[PDB]
Design a protein around this nucleic acid. Structure first.
Length: 1076
RNA sequence: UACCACCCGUGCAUUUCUGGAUCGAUCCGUACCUCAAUGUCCGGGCGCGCGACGUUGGGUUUGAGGGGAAAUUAGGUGCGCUU
DNA sequence: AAGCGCACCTAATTTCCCATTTT
DNA sequence: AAAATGGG
């Protein structure tokens, strides 16, 4: 019928097509997706929003410093407070002495011969503490022999009674449960009669003839109340004193409780500390972030010591906890009085860290155990002048470095034990791994320098035997363990303080530039005192001293460093400079001049150490020597002095540092006083340079490299000063069910009259409607026909408002909350939710039950612009805050893919396809579909791949989000494969690897598309694939069988394997040959 | 299947309701973010001020995509200096 | 070609996005 | 509506 160009698999329909392929899935999950609704605010309303209280609350919830919840949470874990899921659970733990679990259980195991460790007295006083709940398939809460036996077996042994379960276990509960079922009418009644229930089980055990101690007696002792009411925490462990690293200490405290930690993997360790740290579903955090936060903040230290029965010894470890409690500010936003509603994302953050840190501890253990002792460097190499030059240390300091690395592998093995809870100072083990990583970085750097120098010396020596023989005798191989040591995982959060940041970078830029000019004058003063010259042309007799391991190179090295500065300047500057050089006519080709100056390609000077094969740019020598190149730099700088454009200002600062440094590159070969190389600015110094620096005298290279630190901090500050726009995004999620305000429109509605002739819910409602207004209409439907309300409300004129606790419009509305009957018209306050019909159809489907709204996230985004003045001082300006609701939604699929397959080739301009019958594996149709989004991505990212010096400026200058542009292009290619799949009722067959001939931006796209159809081991790929196919993870073809295992094919729902059309027919051939 | 015609970037204007309910009709849903398309501005390139060169070249969908948020780690790229 | 110092851009890890019932 | 926590 219609051709493929006319076929429409898009929008709500592609989501129905996929909902259906998903229902064909062998295995799969339920997915969510967020829909963002901007809240409508007038400019008056947006101006009236105060973001200061929102900033205070977000910094307490998300900050990892003082006054935050990470600091109250960590200091609870470090004071000796174990966390428990309920309060009941904590009271039983605080009564472990009374129970005598071990003793009782051992006696039962011996007397009965049953050997049932799970039957301890404590697990029984529990089942009579907690009643079960009719989870809604619904459970039942009535006390029956069947009910109680199942509930008691689940609590004690952790599983429901099944046929597989040994009969002895089943009978033991049945007989007990039978006694309990006879004696107690209800779980409610049994829970009240704790002592009586224990007596009953004691009688059951005595009837069976066991001489075990009285549980009833235990119950009387256990029946006193633990003072802090409903506490989910119990003090027990000794306190970890003065841990600067808060999270790393909490992980160690928790891991200390685990036994045989080394056998465990990252997943297992993560799950056992996640349970002890945040507790399952952060149920403990409810109390600590609610009534617990009040207790610690508002109880005499003496009564927090009495109520948890803490020894006087730990008082100094508890004194800090109360300060950390008291420091978190009052919760004043989203109508919330305390922090408990914010627990779900606090848990997610900590649990994320715990999982990532536990994997990193387990990695460092494997790395530390592969460091093989005995690596040594040949004595020859340690005495080849050439291959030990430029490492800032002698051969007797590289020997000592390799010895230092082996000693630090032993200290690192003990630091890891201390971090996995085995014992020690945690803060002196973080330091060990730092000092270990630093030593191993210095060794890896030094050996990369020496191996590079070696392969350069070999090539240059060439055929000369004396050179080659002495070189090959210095040969060494870098050991596999000599690598960057992976760091310990950190944790941070809170808002960037914009006004403070700007103050800091303005202060820093002015101070560093002052200190750089000051030092250069001090160096020039000292060289003047001894009467010598900073002759930059003579100092390139150094080109000679390195060459052994002249004038042409001296003048080419001053014109290549001057030239490379212009390459990083504006087109104004690039022209002013370029013309002057063309007048001189130094270059054989002026094409090469502008190629170098404008296209940033090639060079007019190469260092001898450079392994590059491309010859420097040809020049006429006479012109080069005739003209002073340092003179040009003064002239260009002078032209760009008074421009007052920020782009020209930045060139002025770059060329200033180029002039200062080409003068310092001309210093005579001497020994300098070592205070002419000591930096007063804050910068990282490599440890080789810093041990070279802590001496009486330094070489010219040390003087020069320490001065380049001035320039590297200035160039850094420039990236932060030249930021033009950014936003402060604050996200808040409570643990409360999403409530939407359904506001009927204040307009006359003429209900369609065909609605009366229908047997549906809309029919039922349309029949009973007599009133004019849609607010009065919905009241009339509610009162007369209440089952049909929902369907009538979806059609009746309405708006959607949200009560962010920020004010808004007073509206007459009915609250629409999940698993609740719609509210009665109350007067309410809310901000209208902006959105097209496609988004609002998802809110209307919720009234019927076709969709479920989840707990939402409110996002306050505050926009900012930044500008630099004449003095290059940055200024920031904040716009009106935008508020939005990010609503996670779940949606039901209403109740083809196997009988054909389509091979898809991703090519340069679009895709090709070839469809075969899955039954007969024959060719039925082929075609090519140009995608214009591929051509647009290669056109708008051309100057990010061919102008390398300008990739940190391509986004702000060209107003692009390359991530978003790649997201749109993956959007548009997946759309076209999904459209072809839908049009021919075919499952997609893709090649496994994106070719390496393709542009870097297209390779990225073509690999975010192969990973939504083909299977990938990487979790990120599987997560993306499943969310794309609406929870569908695995599919199984009914009749197609793999050659490899003679198993039915697994699809996802694709299978890994004109030019694009030709290629797809070949991908399809490859797939067929891999099936029976 | 008729249609359309140098290419790219930047800025400006314009378009972009794309979802439901009932039996084409009636009613509900006000339309966010991004990509695009349409015209215009200036700059660059190519050919002969002007541009498709039988023809390809392109387009055809109800234009298309929209799962957020937070922390983390690792890698890559750039600039400068030294050997 | 390497090394270092300072930047920015990208890709992957891990977690959250309860419900039930009492008070 | 807020607090506590069951049921995996």
């Amino acid at each position: 019928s219609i051709p493929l160009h006319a076929f429409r698999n898009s929008g709500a329909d592609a989501r129905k097509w996929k909902g259906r392929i998903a229902l064909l899935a062998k295995r799969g999950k339920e997915t969510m997706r967020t829909l963002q609704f901007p809240l409508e605010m007038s400019e008056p309303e947006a101006a009236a929003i105060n973001t200061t209280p929102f900033a205070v609350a977000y910094n307490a919830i998300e900050g990892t410093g003082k006054g935050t919840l990470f600091d109250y949470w960590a200091k609870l874990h470090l004071a000796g407070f174990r966390f428990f899921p309920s309060g009941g659970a904590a009271t039983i733990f605080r009564q472990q002495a009374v129970f005598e679990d071990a003793s009782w259980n051992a006696a039962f195991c011996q007397q009965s011969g049953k050997d049932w460790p799970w039957l301890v007295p404590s697990k029984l006083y529990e089942r009579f503490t907690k009643a079960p709940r009719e989870v809604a398939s619904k459970k039942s809460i009535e006390f029956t022999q069947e009910n109680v036996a199942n509930e008691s077996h689940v609590s004690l042994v952790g599983a429901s009674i099944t046929d597989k379960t040994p009969e002895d276990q089943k009978e033991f509960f049945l007989k007990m449960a039978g006694a309990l079922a006879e004696k107690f009418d209800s779980w409610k009644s049994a829970n009240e009669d704790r002592i009586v229930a224990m007596k009953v089980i004691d009688e059951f055990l005595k009837s069976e003839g066991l001489h075990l101690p009285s549980l009833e007696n235990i119950a009387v002792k256990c029946s006193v109340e633990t003072k802090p009411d409903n506490a989910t925490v119990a003090w027990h462990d000794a306190p970890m004193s003065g841990v600067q690293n808060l999270a790393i200490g909490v992980f160690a405290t928790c891991a200390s409780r685990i036994d045989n930690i080394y056998d465990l993997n990252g997943g297992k360790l993560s799950k056992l500390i996640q349970e002890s740290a945040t507790t399952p579903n952060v149920t403990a955090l409810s109390w600590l972030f609610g009534k617990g936060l009040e207790y610690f903040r508002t109880t005499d230290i003496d009564t927090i010591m009495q109520d948890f029965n803490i020894p006087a010894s730990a008082k100094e470890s508890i004194k800090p906890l109360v300060e950390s409690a008291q420091a978190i500010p009052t919760m004043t936003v989203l109508g919330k009085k305390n922090y408990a509603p914010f627990r779900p994302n606090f848990g997610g953050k900590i649990d994320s860290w715990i999982a990532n840190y536990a994997s990193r501890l387990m990695l460092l253990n494997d790395i530390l155990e592969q460091i093989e002792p005995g690596f040594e460097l040949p004595q020859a190499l340690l005495d080849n002048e050439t291959l030990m030059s430029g490492i800032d240390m002698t051969g007797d300091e590289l020997k000592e470095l390799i010895e230092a690395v082996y000693a630090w592998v032993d200290a690192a093995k003990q630091g890891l034990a201390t971090l996995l809870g085995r014992g020690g100072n945690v803060d002196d083990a973080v330091q060990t791994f730092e000092q270990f990583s630093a030593m191993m970085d210095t060794l890896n750097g030094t050996l990369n320098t020496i191996s590079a120098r070696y392969v350069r010396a070999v090539e240059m020596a060439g055929k000369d035997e004396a050179r080659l023989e002495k070189l090959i005798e210095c040969k060494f191989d870098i050991p596999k363990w000599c690598k960057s040591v992976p760091k310990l995982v950190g944790i941070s959060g809170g808002l960037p303080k914009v006004e403070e940041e700007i103050k800091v970078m303005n202060a820093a830029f002015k101070d560093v530039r002052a200190r750089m000019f000051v030092r250069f004058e001090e160096i020039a003063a000292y060289v003047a005192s001894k009467g010598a010259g900073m002759d930059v042309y003579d100092a390139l007799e150094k080109r000679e001293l390195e060459q052994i391991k002249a004038h042409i190179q001296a003048y080419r090295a001053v014109l290549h460093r001057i030239g490379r500065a212009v390459q990083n300047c504006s087109e104004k500057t690039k022209q002013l400079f370029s013309s002057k050089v063309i007048e001189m006519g130094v270059f054989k080709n002026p094409s090469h001049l502008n190629n170098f100056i404008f296209n940033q390609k090639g060079a007019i000077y190469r260092s001898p150490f450079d392994r590059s094969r491309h010859a420097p740019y040809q020049l006429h020598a006479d012109k080069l020597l005739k003209n002073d190149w340092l003179e040009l730099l003064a002239e260009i700088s002078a032209t760009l002095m008074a421009s007052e454009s920020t782009e020209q200002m930045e060139d002025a600062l770059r060329l200033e540092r180029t002039r200062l440094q080409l003068q310092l590159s001309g210093l005579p070969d001497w020994e300098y006083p070592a205070s002419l190389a000591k930096p007063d600015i804050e910068v990282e110094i490599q440890t080789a340079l810093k041990m070279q620096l802590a001496k009486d005298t330094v070489t010219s290279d040390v003087l020069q490299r320490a001065f380049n630190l001035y320039s590297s901090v200035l160039s850094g500050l420039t990236f932060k000063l030249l930021r033009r726009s950014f936003s402060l995004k604050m996200r808040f999620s409570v643990a409360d069910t999403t409530q939407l305000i359904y506001v009927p429109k204040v307009c006359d509605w003429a209900i369609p009259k065909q609605y009366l002739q229908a047997e549906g819910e809309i029919g039922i409602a349309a029949r009973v409607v007599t009133e004019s207004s849609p607010a009065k209409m919905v009241t009339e439907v509610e009162m007369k026909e209440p089952k049909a309300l929902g369907h009538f409300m979806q059609q009746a004129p309405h708006d959607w408002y949200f009560d962010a606790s920020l004010g808004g419009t007073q509206v007459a509305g009915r609250i629409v909350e999940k698993g609740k009957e719609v509210g009665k018209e109350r007067k309410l306050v809310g901000y209208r939710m902006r959105g097209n019909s496609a988004y609002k159809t998802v809110l209307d489907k919720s009234l019927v039950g076709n969709t479920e709204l989840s707990q939402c996230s409110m996002i306050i985004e505050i926009p900012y612009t930044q500008t630099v003045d004449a003095d290059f001082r940055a200024q920031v300006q904040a716009g009106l805050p935008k508020v939005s609701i990010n609503l996670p939604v779940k949606e039901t699929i209403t109740a083809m893919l196997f009988d054909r397959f389509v091979a898809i080739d991703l090519g340069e301009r679009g895709l090709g396809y070839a469809v075969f019958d899955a039954k007969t594996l024959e060719l039925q149709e082929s075609g090519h579909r140009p995608i214009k989004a591929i051509t647009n991505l290669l056109n708008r990212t051309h100057h990010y791949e061919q102008r390398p010096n300008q990739r940190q400026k391509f986004q702000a200058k060209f107003n692009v989000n390359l991530s978003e542009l790649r997201e749109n292009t993956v959007g548009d290619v997946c759309h076209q494969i999904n459209r072809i799949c839908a049009y021919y009722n075919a499952f997609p067959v893709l090649e496994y690897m994106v070719p390496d001939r393709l542009d870097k931006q297209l390779k990225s796209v073509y690999e975010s598309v192969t990973n939504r159809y083909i299977w990938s081991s990487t979790d990120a790929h599987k997560s993306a694939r499943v969310q794309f196919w609406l929870g569908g993870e695995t599919w199984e073809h009914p009749y197609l069988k793999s050659a490899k295992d003679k198993k039915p094919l697994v699809l996802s729902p694709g299978r890994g394997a004109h030019a694009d059309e030709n290629a797809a027919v070949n991908i399809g051939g490859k797939f067929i040959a891999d099936i029976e």
